[PDB]
Amino acid sequence: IVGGYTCGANTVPYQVSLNSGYHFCGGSLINSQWVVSAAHCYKSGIQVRLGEDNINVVEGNEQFISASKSIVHPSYNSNTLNNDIMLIKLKSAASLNSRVASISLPTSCASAGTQCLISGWGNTKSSGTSYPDVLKCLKAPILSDSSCKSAYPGQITSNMFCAGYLEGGKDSCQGDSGGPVVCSGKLQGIVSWGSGCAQKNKPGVYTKVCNYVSWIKQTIASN
Numbered sequence: 001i002v003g004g005y006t007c008g009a010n011t012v013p014y015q016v017s018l019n020s021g022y023h024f025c026g027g028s029l030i031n032s033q034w035v036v037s038a039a040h041c042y043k044s045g046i047q048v049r050l051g052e053d054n055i056n057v058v059e060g061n062e063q064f065i066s067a068s069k070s071i072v073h074p075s076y077n078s079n080t081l082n083n084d085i086m087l088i089k090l091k092s093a094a095s096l097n098s099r100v101a102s103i104s105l106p107t108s109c110a111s112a113g114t115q116c117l118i119s120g121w122g123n124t125k126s127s128g129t130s131y132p133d134v135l136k137c138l139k140a141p142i143l144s145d146s147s148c149k150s151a152y153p154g155q156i157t158s159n160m161f162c163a164g165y166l167e168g169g170k171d172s173c174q175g176d177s178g179g180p181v182v183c184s185g186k187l188q189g190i191v192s193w194g195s196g197c198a199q200k201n202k203p204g205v206y207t208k209v210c211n212y213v214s215w216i217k218q219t220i221a222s223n
């Protein structure tokens, strides 16, 4: 997260760290046995880490749970990043509490100007790599489709939206991928891609989760 603020420990209880010996992606807990992340975060050997603040220190409230399966959207396209979403099933159900909790799926898509909360443990600088220990937070609005498509002509599908600041200086970045964009208490986005981080006129692009709710529900029901 570039230009954000320290969330505070366990203030974002649905936030997850995907770990393979190191943090590589975020995710969101959507019930006690399933996580939503980005398709481009796919790998084998994923451990899900719940209840984290400092990812480098065991502080209490952590639960480490292996992924038993990862389900990349079958129409995910690695070139265009269309359908950049993946479901992860936990080996065992998480123990839900004040500090470990699920986030609701949306019943409707969010409109432009909706202010959202984006969080993660990714890079906090644009040019240069500085990773935080603790979870960072950023408040950012959803941009209009017209502004999104003028920023990234020809690259924006109906399954994507832009959020952030055209003036720059505030954005998600490397390591934030697959993390949550939560607006009015519902999961509306997944950190997917962008052009650098926090560059002027290059806002972040996010998977539009409201387009996948039935897929999510049908997939979880059958697995």
Ligand SMILES: CC[C@@H]1[C@@H]2[C@H](C(=O)N1Cc1ccc3c(c1)OCO3)[C@H](c1ccc(C(=N)N)cc1)N1CCC[C@@H]21
Residues within 6 Å of the ligand: 040, 078, 079, 080, 081, 155, 171, 172, 173, 174, 175, 177, 191, 192, 193, 194, 195, 196, 197, 198, 203, 204, 205
């Ligand atoms: C694996 C994808 C990679 C991903 C994300 C991204 O931007 N990519 C580049 C990419 C790939 C294909 C594309 C694309 C961008 O635009 C159209 O098609 C991602 C990324 C980069 C920048 C932001 C951001 N500024 N909000 C958000 C996510 N990077 C960081 C680490 C993983 C890598």
Ligand SMILES: [Ca+2]
Residues within 6 Å of the ligand: 052, 053, 054, 055, 056, 057, 058, 059, 060, 062
């Ligand atoms: Ca920790």
